[PDB]
Symmetry: D4
Subunit: 158 residues, 8 copies
Amino acid sequence: APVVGIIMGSQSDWETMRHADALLTELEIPHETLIVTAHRTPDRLADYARTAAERGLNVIIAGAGGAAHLPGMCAAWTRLPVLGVPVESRALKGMDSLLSIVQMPGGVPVGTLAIGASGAKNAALLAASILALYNPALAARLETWRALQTASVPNSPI
Amino acid sequence: SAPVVGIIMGSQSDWETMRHADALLTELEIPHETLIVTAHRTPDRLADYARTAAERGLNVIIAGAGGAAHLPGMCAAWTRLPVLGVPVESRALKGMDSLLSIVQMPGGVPVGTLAIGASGAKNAALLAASILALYNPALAARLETWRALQTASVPNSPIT
Amino acid sequence: APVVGIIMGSQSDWETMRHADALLTELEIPHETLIVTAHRTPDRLADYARTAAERGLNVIIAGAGGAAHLPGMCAAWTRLPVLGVPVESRALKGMDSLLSIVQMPGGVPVGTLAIGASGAKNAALLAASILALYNPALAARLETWRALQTASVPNSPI
Amino acid sequence: SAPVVGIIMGSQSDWETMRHADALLTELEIPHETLIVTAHRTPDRLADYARTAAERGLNVIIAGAGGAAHLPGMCAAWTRLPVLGVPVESRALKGMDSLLSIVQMPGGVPVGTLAIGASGAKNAALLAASILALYNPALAARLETWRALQTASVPNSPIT
Amino acid sequence: SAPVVGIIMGSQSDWETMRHADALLTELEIPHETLIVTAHRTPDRLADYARTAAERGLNVIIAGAGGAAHLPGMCAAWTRLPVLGVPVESRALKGMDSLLSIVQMPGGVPVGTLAIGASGAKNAALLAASILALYNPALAARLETWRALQTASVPNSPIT
Amino acid sequence: APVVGIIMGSQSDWETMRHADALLTELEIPHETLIVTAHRTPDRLADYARTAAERGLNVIIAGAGGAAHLPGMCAAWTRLPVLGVPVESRALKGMDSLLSIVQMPGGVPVGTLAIGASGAKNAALLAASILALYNPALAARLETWRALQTASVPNSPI
Amino acid sequence: SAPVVGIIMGSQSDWETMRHADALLTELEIPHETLIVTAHRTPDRLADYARTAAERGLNVIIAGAGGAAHLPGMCAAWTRLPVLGVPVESRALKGMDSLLSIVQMPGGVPVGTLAIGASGAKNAALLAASILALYNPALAARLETWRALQTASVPNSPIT
Amino acid sequence: APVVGIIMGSQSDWETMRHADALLTELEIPHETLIVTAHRTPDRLADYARTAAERGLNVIIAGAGGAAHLPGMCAAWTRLPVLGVPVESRALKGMDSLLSIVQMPGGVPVGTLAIGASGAKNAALLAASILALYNPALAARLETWRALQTASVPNSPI
């Protein structure tokens, strides 16, 4: 049963959000990966977010670009931690994505990651760090992952 | 006297801006309602408001919000009515976050966006009036008079 | 007889504004699609805007980029609703387009849509939503269009 | 004493900025007129002003506006005279909307743009003077004297 | 009563912002510590704090900084715990430098970033609470009550 | 003898400044086109600007990108009108170019045109409009040029 | 007591910022001169100052300017000495024009750029001190002591 | 023995930082070129910076992109002058790089150069100008380098 949900507004976002999916798979974290759009399927979004906790989800990772409302509206309907990935937009390079996700008024948080692929990977890692607080086997796998990241850095450029 | 325009905003702090929309609709004698609806703290209230707007007889919705401003966009997701968005000026980013959060809607769900701040609130009311005037001759006459007086009221030179 | 006018400053804008044209055609809304430039044909613009209402136009959709003055000057000469599409510019990616269209001082409104193709499509949809207020057959077609948009969203990425 | 420069602005609020252009033309003894012309509220007034400027004997137009600042650009569309644009500082976006709305003219219709705010108004007057000085020897002499005094007036060190 | 959240900031000037995180953790009865740790002036203090956080029993770190804001990112480099970052508003660039310095972490080392300023500090505390509530039923109940009261406290219309 | 000088900091700027050169040629305005860099040939710049008037130049058009100082420093050394063209830079797309040219403190003006090719063309046109004030034959050719620009705009997109 | 650092600025208004560089050099007992040199109003003064700096015994130049800030860059064009640039905060664009005008030097002519405003002025002095300390042991000792006291002066927690 | 250290966070930065390496080689300045990342090898960074002076380094040139912390954290651990090169990032074109490097609060300086290749070249030149203060042979070679830069500028575009 999934403990993280990865959701995104459209197929075009998958180029970005696949990096989150891959990282959860590497760390062997059960998850579901779905399309949910705030603007085109608002009722789907409401149902998804409001039932997330009772379905056993622990963390939601949401990616969107442009006027990016998916993470914020997800957080409006759930008490679960919601992590937001600004997807790079064509004209404004994800600056619109970033501001529309991170600038949540007080009371309804979205933990926001970097624009683009880096943010998708880091949303998965941040989700893993949250789950590791109460899953010792995963905490060990995450320690190994971070140790390998550090150890594998070369000493000089090629 | 049933409302044909709804003015909605996320907070009392938004009223400082949205009051200009309210005043202009009153000036033009357009029946309206003015409410607080917040996308993030009352999302079910927003869904209900937007999805029943047409059946309640609303023709246009004017929505104002600042920061990560999601109220206009989520309103438009739930209604076929035209939704006009007013970016409310934010403290740190001067409404640039408000503007981009509102205007940059992906294709399929429009929000007609006006200027940051009081100017945008006034123009949202005027744009709503222009829409209503298409099928209300008396209002069309009031609006043309309003625009004509605006033009006639412009002085020819500045006061030193 | 056209009830929406789509106008743009140059042939290069057509790559963007064709999305508005296509959407009005899909919804079977009679329209005209023309080149009118604020800076190179200002008298053409004045004549077009000031006679729009008496020609039977209900809404004008205007696209321009850079120092984008076409929507604002159109609105100066007509009481019809004017919708503005910021066309993506080469250097500043339509940020100049966006600010020069949306930041109208109070008294003369332009309802502004997103930079680029999305904005062109949405200007046509917003025009349709305006016309639907007093055209029941169109209102039904627009409802169908929005219902299909919502219903056709897949549940997961490929 | 017929004007050779026209200073135009959209509103009385612009005068706080454009007064610096007016003062500098007066200092240099350049005959000018100072008027309010708004692109959006008096578009026919603007068309008439711009299209008759050359025949009225104007040589240069200095135009100031803020926000979606269209006055300089639309002026240039209707005249062959050089048009200089002053971006007036706006409240929310600090004149960045003013600047981009003025300077980013597509090829074919120029506006020579100066700095945001009072500095730009002063420099628009000085640039106009530089243009006129090309075919007015007395003014050329006054302008060179003005620039020379500017340079000579710079102190060698700051006051603590 | 041992702390499970650490709130850290680079300077006393940051406290004006970070106090909102501290207040909210107290409201929700979450044991925490509040400290000054600066990335640039006490880098060894930061390394020691971050690398011992987990063994000291901390579950979440909330870090605030402005300008070239490196404290959250360098904290995350030294710990496996979730690190939440609060961009503190800077004088010249209004926290845009703070925001980009914090949120734009390269892949491999996450910082969950909140809004510029007081809103972000409040939300960092709430996000930390949401994380802790996953494995603390009493806190989960307090947090749901908190969110429910927030929603219920929203008025239906503005005060004119 | 040249009455307009077109100067630029490097060969890479020519892709942009060639549009100014072409326009002056079309209008049959005698000009010179040169490389002068503020940062690498500062003494060349000082000599060029300070002798411009006595050499018979009427207007200088200066293009530069990045920290773009060429127009401003030219204006510091001459009483002639100086027109500045922000050249599009690789990273910041000429926003650095634009701000470093247009934001001249009061006392030393640079008339600034748009980023890129449009600005180069318009600097040449603005120079022509200045010269036309006291050259009737050129004024007529410029009127013809502007009339053709206006007249040649098509009525609809292809 | 001959100066080894020159602090230059375009205007008296810049002194509010550049005074912080002056104070720090004095604290560290580094002989210096503090002058007004403007790129646009005294370009020959600037050329002479920069091109004679090395022969006059200067080792480092600290230059501050705002807006279209050309003083640091043009200084570096005329000298082989290291030139450090301080972006002075501008009214409209908050020093973003100052920053980009200074830091974005094309390859071949460097300006080492510091933060917008007072922080940058202080750091320009400290960076100059770091450069001089490479070949002055007494100053190297004073600078290490200065940095050590900075670190030791950081409190462990904020004052509520 | 190296007197300048060039460090960067990853292999992808080498495309940029190679310009610094080439310039130091041209001026015959002994240097070392290494990978050190603030976020993935923070202990490596601490050791590198804190021992730099005693190893005989005089200047450190550090390049990083995105949330770019490498130069600032290097400066935190050394009294040596640290020069920072903002590497161009994919989405925000190095504006994030630039602000996260240059906006150091008072007390810990980083001398910042332009975004990208230009900044890498100039960091090497600025390092050379620092070293030239107390190395006469290098000072002469740097004078020659700058003289050739100035002298080799063509008089007109091709």
